[PDB]
Structure 1
Amino acid sequence: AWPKVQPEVNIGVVGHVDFGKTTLVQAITGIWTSKHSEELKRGMTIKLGYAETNIGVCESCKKPEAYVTEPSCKSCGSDDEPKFLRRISFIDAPGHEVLMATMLSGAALMDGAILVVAANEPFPQPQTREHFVALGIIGVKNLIIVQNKVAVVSKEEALSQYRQIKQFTKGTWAENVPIIPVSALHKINIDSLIEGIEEYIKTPYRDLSQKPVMLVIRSFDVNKPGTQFNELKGGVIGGSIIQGLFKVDQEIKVLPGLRVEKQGKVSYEPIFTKISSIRFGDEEFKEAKPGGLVAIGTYLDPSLTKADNLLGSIITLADAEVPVLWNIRIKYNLLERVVGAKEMLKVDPIRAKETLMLSVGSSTTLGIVTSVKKDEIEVELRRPVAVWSNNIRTVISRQIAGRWRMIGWGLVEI
């Protein structure tokens, strides 16, 4: 008698490369997130992976084994069904070096986070530190550190690394962050991770008063090949809602929208449409709340949505007043040292005329610095950015050693 509702919380899974993120998400949800051919062939995550599962508890059994991801208490004794707590979803971020820009985007969609640390690898490491301080910046401080691959190391070594993690987090915003030893591959001590999720990653408060805003991270064409032009389904736009709620048959718009070429001149025109369908995985719904990753059916030509073309864009109501800016002011603060790089090196102050990478919401855009002050910089963006609210958290990256590395953050001023 478990209800078929949408996920109510987004838990991001971040960490260094090949530490077992996707295998962990599979160990919990039973689903392999990587569905693209490229990432299945290369054996990594390239685009944000998604997977969801129900969470329940057999309140007549002993925790943490009392927790289940399916409506059955046969594994603990009683034949009655467990108490449905909530449905959760995971955002599986890539742990690769040159995919940081993706992770940041995913971080805009996270309510809580899990940081995967390999027990068979030394601590700390590049993308570990980087994703850590990134989560600190974004505001995803509902964190759980997971000691994966614990089955290949002795308890002495596991505790040895544990001490190092506690030392590392000692004196930071993550000082009291829990550390849970699991084995994603062989499914060892997963129940404790479920329990930890329920304890430390609670479902946030959603103020439905705020205007409906969705951050787009994917878009595609559900039309199977050779489909005649009369049976062509509308374009589908996928992403996460950060505030408010969307309903079917609602008038919406995509910002900045569509790139337009007029004899070499480039502009951007908002994409107006109507929600034809809303789904969360295989289940279809009439509403769409924050938490989970929603597929929004539109009346758009599939040509516009094909191949994640609307990535980074946002979706609001048609009559919403939203500034789409080519130039933005940012009240910034820089990091002290470049955390992503393998070599320890400090970060130069923002130079005029310098080109930077800005992560605003789910959008990554390059821009040239036009004004430099102690607390504020002004940037001329190569492409427009939709700024739905005031004080939007942005992430500032600079190209170092040929690769874009995070150097600091800021808030978008309007």
Structure 2
Amino acid sequence: AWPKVQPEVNIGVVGHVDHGKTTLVQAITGIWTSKHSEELKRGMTIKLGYAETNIGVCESCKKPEAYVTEPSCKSCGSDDEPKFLRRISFIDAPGHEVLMATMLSGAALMDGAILVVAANEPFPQPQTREHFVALGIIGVKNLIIVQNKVDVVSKEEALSQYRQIKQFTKGTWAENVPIIPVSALHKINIDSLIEGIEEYIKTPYRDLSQKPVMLVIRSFDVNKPGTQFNELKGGVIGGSIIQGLFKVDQEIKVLPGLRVEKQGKVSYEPIFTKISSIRFGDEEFKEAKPGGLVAIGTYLDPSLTKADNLLGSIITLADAEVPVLWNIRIKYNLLERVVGAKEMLKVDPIRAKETLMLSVGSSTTLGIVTSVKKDEIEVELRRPVAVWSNNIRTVISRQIAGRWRMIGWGLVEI
């Protein structure tokens, strides 16, 4: 049989609202991310859609038809069980997509991505352009561009758009990003895309020795009304593990931790607890490595997690040595101009004393610029951030319009 393992890679599906995301993830996993089917034990997030599936391959059959997401090769001859390759995950935003602190969270999480393009829409729609830059900012490594709705246009028209795309990434990092044409609605050429993600979005190297770090993006009080006091469960923490691994029964801590305001002065003292359980989807595990969205059971007073109280925090082992700074130094790189409302907009260089919004992992706090230089700036922060590794990508954003907007990215230096 195939093994009941956990996902080992996260793929985010980004698509201009109405190009195919929700349906495309379904054509692959067989699940509908956005609005869906179970909560009694089905993995949930702050708001974003999420789905997982196994990936296999039939040894006898030819490709791409040989890739399967289920343990069967009948579809092409064999009564033989196909070869398992890996279990994967998909994340996307329900009938929408950026939401501004969401696209920033899903960044330290995404291992690769998929840009959905409607084949019956002139390329590139505005929202696609910004998705495109957002991905560059985010540092999206492995990318695949999917030409959706290809079944509603002619081969020639599809080809026409194909070129437009190829000659839009003609001079960017996307230079070679593959373009795969499909129909998520009617499921057409879906097998090629699965080949395409097996080739272009490979599972990243995993140094299992690195110190464990998980980004918290969800947390709650699982207890239902009526629960008896001696029978209630500890708080629960949903997040994605970035590096290392966590095991049930390990002592851990939450950073920055608990916000305490003694003497009218704010300050955060880390929150300690132990892992009571690890769950991926609806199945329990012993350990939790990077890949997929994991649910961690603790021994925390439900008041602590209740209603995503711990969102933006990170979990590490109790003795892990992780700074928690209220002032950080960032080696940055801005954008020349941002996708403005009308047509464009030019970004002003970082001016001192102006308030910005940085993203660190699943964190997003506002800070005041205290220092500003060619390649570096320093900022005071409203709330502190845990810095588990040296250079951790950060996303600088400015309330350009009336709405915050990415204006560059940088590395947190310590």
TM-score, reference length from structure 1: 0.94
- Contact in 2 for aligned 1:391/1:411 (Cα 8 Å): yes
Secondary structure of residue in 1 paired with 2:74: coil
Secondary structure of residue in 1 paired with 2:267: strand
Seen in structure 2, the aligned counterparts of structure 1 residues 36 and 396 have a Cα distance that, compared at 3 Å, is: farther
Seen in structure 2, the aligned counterparts of structure 1 residues 378 and 17 have a Cα distance that, compared at 3 Å, is: same
Give 5+ residue unaligned stretches, structure 2.
Answer: none
Secondary structure of residue in 1 paired with 2:252: strand
Offset of residue 148 of structure 1: 1.4
Of residues 58-67 and 153-162 in structure 1, the stretch that sits farther from structure 2 once superposed is 153-162
Query: Identity over the aligned pairs, expressed in percent?
Result: 100
Question: Aligned equivalents of 2:21 and 2:249: distance in 1?
Answer: 37
Offset of residue 44 of structure 1: 15
* C-alpha distance after superposition, 1:232-272 (max 9, x if no partner): 11111111111111001000001011222336432212110
Seen in structure 2, the aligned counterparts of structure 1 residues 193 and 208 have a Cα distance that, compared at 3 Å, is: same
Offset of residue 135 of structure 1: 2.4
Offset of residue 93 of structure 1: 3.5
Secondary structure of residue in 2 paired with 1:309: coil
| Match in the other structure for 2:350 | 350
Of residues 39-48 and 158-167 in structure 1, the stretch that sits farther from structure 2 once superposed is 39-48
- Contact in 2 for aligned 1:55/1:86 (Cα 8 Å): yes
Of residues 32-41 and 132-141 in structure 1, the stretch that sits farther from structure 2 once superposed is 32-41
Seen in structure 2, the aligned counterparts of structure 1 residues 67 and 239 have a Cα distance that, compared at 3 Å, is: same
- Contact in 1 for aligned 2:357/2:364 (Cα 8 Å): yes
* C-alpha distance after superposition, 1:256-312 (max 9, x if no partner): 112223364322121100000001101111011111111111111222112211111
* C-alpha distance after superposition, 1:342-367 (max 9, x if no partner): 52111111111111111111111111
Offset of residue 42 of structure 1: 21
Seen in structure 2, the aligned counterparts of structure 1 residues 146 and 297 have a Cα distance that, compared at 3 Å, is: same
Offset of residue 25 of structure 1: 1.1
Secondary structure of residue in 2 paired with 1:199: helix
Question: Aligned equivalents of 1:98 and 1:41: distance in 2?
Answer: 27
How many corresponding residue pairs? 414
Seen in structure 2, the aligned counterparts of structure 1 residues 346 and 210 have a Cα distance that, compared at 3 Å, is: same
* C-alpha distance after superposition, 1:75-132 (max 9, x if no partner): 1111111111111111224574760321121011011111111112222133322222
Seen in structure 2, the aligned counterparts of structure 1 residues 162 and 108 have a Cα distance that, compared at 3 Å, is: same
Of residues 136-145 and 21-30 in structure 1, the stretch that sits farther from structure 2 once superposed is 136-145
Offset of residue 405 of structure 1: 1.2
Question: Aligned equivalents of 1:205 and 1:253: distance in 2?
Answer: 26
- Contact in 2 for aligned 1:240/1:291 (Cα 8 Å): yes
Secondary structure of residue in 2 paired with 1:385: strand
- Contact in 1 for aligned 2:33/2:94 (Cα 8 Å): no
- The 5-angstrom pairing of residues 175-324 of structure 1 reads 175-262=175-262, 264-324=264-324
Of residues 24-33 and 197-206 in structure 1, the stretch that sits farther from structure 2 once superposed is 24-33
Offset of residue 38 of structure 1: 15
TM-score, reference length from structure 2: 0.94
Seen in structure 2, the aligned counterparts of structure 1 residues 97 and 403 have a Cα distance that, compared at 3 Å, is: farther
| Match in the other structure for 2:163 | 163
Secondary structure of residue in 1 paired with 2:217: strand
Secondary structure of residue in 2 paired with 1:160: helix
Question: Aligned equivalents of 2:97 and 2:241: distance in 1?
Answer: 27
Question: Aligned equivalents of 2:304 and 2:46: distance in 1?
Answer: 22
Secondary structure of residue in 2 paired with 1:40: coil
Question: Aligned equivalents of 2:281 and 2:264: distance in 1?
Answer: 40
- Contact in 2 for aligned 1:312/1:361 (Cα 8 Å): yes
Question: Aligned equivalents of 2:263 and 2:307: distance in 1?
Answer: 25
Seen in structure 2, the aligned counterparts of structure 1 residues 42 and 298 have a Cα distance that, compared at 3 Å, is: closer
Question: Aligned equivalents of 1:40 and 1:19: distance in 2?
Answer: 31
Seen in structure 2, the aligned counterparts of structure 1 residues 99 and 239 have a Cα distance that, compared at 3 Å, is: same
Secondary structure of residue in 2 paired with 1:184: coil
| Match in the other structure for 2:78 | 78
Seen in structure 2, the aligned counterparts of structure 1 residues 44 and 6 have a Cα distance that, compared at 3 Å, is: closer
Offset of residue 325 of structure 1: 1.1
Of residues 68-77 and 261-270 in structure 1, the stretch that sits farther from structure 2 once superposed is 261-270
Secondary structure of residue in 2 paired with 1:266: strand
Query: Cα RMSD over matched residues?
Result: 2.9
Seen in structure 2, the aligned counterparts of structure 1 residues 96 and 402 have a Cα distance that, compared at 3 Å, is: farther
Seen in structure 2, the aligned counterparts of structure 1 residues 100 and 341 have a Cα distance that, compared at 3 Å, is: farther
Secondary structure of residue in 2 paired with 1:320: coil
Offset of residue 40 of structure 1: 17
- Contact in 1 for aligned 2:46/2:218 (Cα 8 Å): no
Seen in structure 2, the aligned counterparts of structure 1 residues 311 and 43 have a Cα distance that, compared at 3 Å, is: closer
Question: Aligned equivalents of 2:386 and 2:349: distance in 1?
Answer: 27
| Match in the other structure for 2:140 | 140
Offset of residue 330 of structure 1: 0.7
- Contact in 2 for aligned 1:340/1:406 (Cα 8 Å): no
Seen in structure 2, the aligned counterparts of structure 1 residues 43 and 189 have a Cα distance that, compared at 3 Å, is: farther
Seen in structure 2, the aligned counterparts of structure 1 residues 4 and 40 have a Cα distance that, compared at 3 Å, is: closer
- Contact in 1 for aligned 2:22/2:95 (Cα 8 Å): no
Question: Aligned equivalents of 2:283 and 2:387: distance in 1?
Answer: 31
- Contact in 1 for aligned 2:15/2:97 (Cα 8 Å): no
Offset of residue 168 of structure 1: 0.6
